Design an enzyme around this catalytic site. Structure first.
Site, PDB file in Angstrom:
ATOM      1  N   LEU A  28       0.845  -1.196   0.000  1.00 40.63           N
ATOM      2  CA  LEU A  28       0.000   0.000   0.000  1.00 40.63           C
ATOM      3  C   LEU A  28       0.868   1.229   0.000  1.00 40.63           C
ATOM      4  CD1 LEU A  28      -2.898  -1.003   2.432  1.00 40.63           C
ATOM      5  CD2 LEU A  28      -2.924  -1.054  -0.049  1.00 40.63           C
ATOM      6  N   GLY A  29       1.933   1.206   0.795  1.00 37.85           N
ATOM      7  CA  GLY A  29       2.855   2.324   0.926  1.00 37.85           C
ATOM      8  C   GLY A  29       4.010   1.985   1.840  1.00 37.85           C
ATOM      9  N   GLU A  30       5.039   2.857   1.867  1.00 38.88           N
ATOM     10  CA  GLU A  30       6.221   2.640   2.697  1.00 38.88           C
ATOM     11  C   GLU A  30       6.225   3.556   3.933  1.00 38.88           C
ATOM     12  N   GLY A  31      10.074   0.475   7.084  1.00 41.31           N
ATOM     13  CA  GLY A  31       8.646   0.481   7.377  1.00 41.31           C
ATOM     14  C   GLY A  31       7.792   0.429   6.124  1.00 41.31           C
ATOM     15  N   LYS A  32       6.748  -0.430   6.127  1.00 42.86           N
ATOM     16  CA  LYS A  32       5.856  -0.590   4.978  1.00 42.86           C
ATOM     17  C   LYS A  32       4.490  -1.089   5.437  1.00 42.86           C
ATOM     18  N   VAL A  33       3.458  -0.756   4.663  1.00 42.98           N
ATOM     19  CA  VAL A  33       2.090  -1.194   4.925  1.00 42.98           C
ATOM     20  C   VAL A  33       1.651  -2.004   3.707  1.00 42.98           C
ATOM     21  CG1 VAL A  33      -0.259  -0.600   5.680  1.00 42.98           C
ATOM     22  CG2 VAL A  33       1.678   0.815   6.415  1.00 42.98           C
ATOM     23  N   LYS A  52       1.282  -3.594   8.953  1.00 39.53           N
ATOM     24  CA  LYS A  52       2.456  -2.737   9.065  1.00 39.53           C
ATOM     25  C   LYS A  52       3.592  -3.564   9.611  1.00 39.53           C
ATOM     26  CE  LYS A  52       3.893   1.854  10.478  1.00 39.53           C
ATOM     27  NZ  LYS A  52       3.370   3.163  10.933  1.00 39.53           N
ATOM     28  N   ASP A 138       2.861  13.799  12.758  1.00 35.62           N
ATOM     29  CA  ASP A 138       2.871  13.473  11.331  1.00 35.62           C
ATOM     30  C   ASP A 138       1.511  13.713  10.696  1.00 35.62           C
ATOM     31  OD1 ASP A 138       4.280  12.602   9.015  1.00 35.62           O
ATOM     32  OD2 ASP A 138       3.930  10.473   9.395  1.00 35.62           O
TER      33      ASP A 138
HETATM   34  C1  BFK Z   1      -3.983   1.284   8.282  1.00 39.86           C
HETATM   35  C2  BFK Z   1      -4.439   1.432   6.850  1.00 39.86           C
HETATM   36  C3  BFK Z   1      -5.670   0.956   6.413  1.00 39.86           C
HETATM   37  N1  BFK Z   1      -6.124   1.075   5.154  1.00 39.86           N
HETATM   38  C4  BFK Z   1      -5.270   1.653   4.290  1.00 39.86           C
HETATM   39  N2  BFK Z   1      -5.692   1.766   2.994  1.00 39.86           N
HETATM   40  C5  BFK Z   1      -5.046   2.241   1.834  1.00 39.86           C
HETATM   41  C6  BFK Z   1      -3.932   3.075   1.879  1.00 39.86           C
HETATM   42  C7  BFK Z   1      -3.315   3.536   0.717  1.00 39.86           C
HETATM   43  N3  BFK Z   1      -2.228   4.444   0.785  1.00 39.86           N
HETATM   44  C8  BFK Z   1      -2.465   5.653   1.594  1.00 39.86           C
HETATM   45  C9  BFK Z   1      -1.194   6.482   1.748  1.00 39.86           C
HETATM   46  N4  BFK Z   1      -0.616   6.794   0.440  1.00 39.86           N
HETATM   47  C10 BFK Z   1       0.569   7.642   0.581  1.00 39.86           C
HETATM   48  C11 BFK Z   1      -0.287   5.550  -0.252  1.00 39.86           C
HETATM   49  C12 BFK Z   1      -1.534   4.725  -0.485  1.00 39.86           C
HETATM   50  C13 BFK Z   1      -3.811   3.101  -0.519  1.00 39.86           C
HETATM   51  C14 BFK Z   1      -4.886   2.221  -0.553  1.00 39.86           C
HETATM   52  S1  BFK Z   1      -5.485   1.664  -2.122  1.00 39.86           S
HETATM   53  C15 BFK Z   1      -6.444   3.007  -2.715  1.00 39.86           C
HETATM   54  O1  BFK Z   1      -4.359   1.484  -2.991  1.00 39.86           O
HETATM   55  O2  BFK Z   1      -6.354   0.551  -1.897  1.00 39.86           O
HETATM   56  C16 BFK Z   1      -5.518   1.791   0.604  1.00 39.86           C
HETATM   57  N5  BFK Z   1      -4.026   2.093   4.570  1.00 39.86           N
HETATM   58  C17 BFK Z   1      -3.618   1.980   5.844  1.00 39.86           C
HETATM   59  N6  BFK Z   1      -2.395   2.482   6.197  1.00 39.86           N
HETATM   60  C18 BFK Z   1      -1.382   3.058   5.389  1.00 39.86           C
HETATM   61  C19 BFK Z   1      -1.098   2.540   4.126  1.00 39.86           C
HETATM   62  C20 BFK Z   1      -0.102   3.116   3.351  1.00 39.86           C
HETATM   63  C21 BFK Z   1       0.588   4.226   3.814  1.00 39.86           C
HETATM   64  C22 BFK Z   1       0.297   4.776   5.056  1.00 39.86           C
HETATM   65  C23 BFK Z   1       1.030   5.993   5.555  1.00 39.86           C
HETATM   66  O3  BFK Z   1       0.554   7.187   4.943  1.00 39.86           O
HETATM   67  C24 BFK Z   1      -0.697   4.185   5.836  1.00 39.86           C
END
Ligand code: BFK
Length: 289
Positions: A28-30, A31-33, A52, A138
């Site tokens: 999903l994004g970057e 530590g990484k999620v 995470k 943040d």
């Molecule tokens: C705890 C959580 C629950 N649900 C999501 N969902 C979710 C997140 C994203 N990111 C959000 C932050 N952007 C910089 C990068 C993308 C994208 C999708 S998608 C549209 O691709 O399905 C979904 N993210 C979480 N945390 C998270 C993920 C990535 C980065 C960060 C830190 O900014 C926190």
């Protein structure tokens, strides 16, 4: 007969996620999620979760302990952990992503009234965090997750620190990856973090929300135009200089002056002169009436 151990009655912890059933879908994004499906039945029916993990173990453990004990409508839900020394934090997954991805794609759906309602929800989440004696450090649109068209949640607590009882701020030591364009002057100059410092970051996040997270109108893009984009190591002192002079981010296009005035109250140079989250909630609620 061979002696063996009596088996104690097995109990299942719903916050304990077994490694073997936690299946990766994508980053999903970057530590990484990462987006995973927790699939104990192995038929792709399991729940989707955000995981995470580390690419600093102590910092992740502190983050898990903070999030496990936060319960609020505008704070992303903790679900559990996956343990190896290693650990992964398991959270609910929000498919709409952050305001950074959602706002550019949904301008037609999200009008001023909806932007002010998101602003109220961010303030309510932040005021709850402050009531638990935490500084987020943040607060940015990239860390505000979209639950639905009608609800946002603060979605990451990676830099969150506790403020000591009877103290006003937390002093930071590790600052190399600081989001300087969202930081109040006391953070940039002395690495001191007050609840009022999160109010400053909120003003910047409010600017992003009002610009629908347009990359050309981002706080970094705008500040770099104001100070110069090719200064490298001299960037922060040039930023500090600009703020000392009274220069602030301009009014977003189509933003009414009364909304911009609430935003400017987040950016008083001295932390003691800044508005509170409760006062921001009241200001937005008066505009929504
Ligand atoms: C705890 C959580 C629950 N649900 C999501 N969902 C979710 C997140 C994203 N990111 C959000 C932050 N952007 C910089 C990068 C993308 C994208 C999708 S998608 C549209 O691709 O399905 C979904 N993210 C979480 N945390 C998270 C993920 C990535 C980065 C960060 C830190 O900014 C926190």
């Amino acid at each position: 007969d061979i002696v063996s151990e009596k088996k104690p009655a097995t109990e299942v912890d719903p916050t304990h996620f077994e490694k073997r059933f936690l299946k990766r879908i994508r980053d999903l994004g970057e530590g990484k999620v990462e987006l995973c499906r927790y699939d104990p039945e192995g038929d792709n029916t399991g729940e989707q979760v955000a995981v995470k993990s580390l690419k600093h173990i102590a910092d992740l453990k502190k983050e898990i302990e903070i999030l496990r004990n936060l319960y609020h409508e505008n704070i992303v839900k903790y679900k559990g952990i996956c343990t190896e020394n290693g650990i992964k934090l398991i959270m609910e997954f929000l498919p709409s992503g952050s305001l950074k991805e959602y706002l550019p794609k949904n301008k037609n759906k999200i009008n001023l009234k909806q932007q002010l309602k998101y602003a109220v929800q961010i303030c309510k989440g932040m005021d709850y965090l402050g009531s638990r004696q935490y500084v987020h450090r943040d607060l940015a649109a990239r860390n505000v997750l979209v639950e639905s068209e009608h609800q946002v949640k603060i979605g990451d607590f990676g830099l969150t620190k506790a403020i000591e009882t009877d103290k006003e701020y937390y002093t930071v030591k590790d600052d190399r990856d600081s989001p300087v364009f969202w930081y109040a002057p006391e953070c940039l100059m002395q690495s001191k973090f007050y609840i009022a410092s999160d109010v400053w970051s909120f003003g910047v996040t409010l600017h992003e929300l009002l610009t629908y997270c347009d990359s050309d109108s981002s706080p970094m893009a705008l500040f770099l135009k104001m100070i110069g984009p090719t200064h490298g190591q001299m960037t922060v002192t040039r930023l500090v200089n600009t703020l000392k002079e009274g220069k602030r981010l301009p009014c977003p296009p189509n933003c009414p002056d009364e909304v911009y005035q609430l935003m400017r109250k987040c950016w008083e140079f001295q932390p003691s002169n800044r508005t509170s989250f409760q006062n921001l909630i009241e200001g937005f609620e008066a505009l929504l009436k």
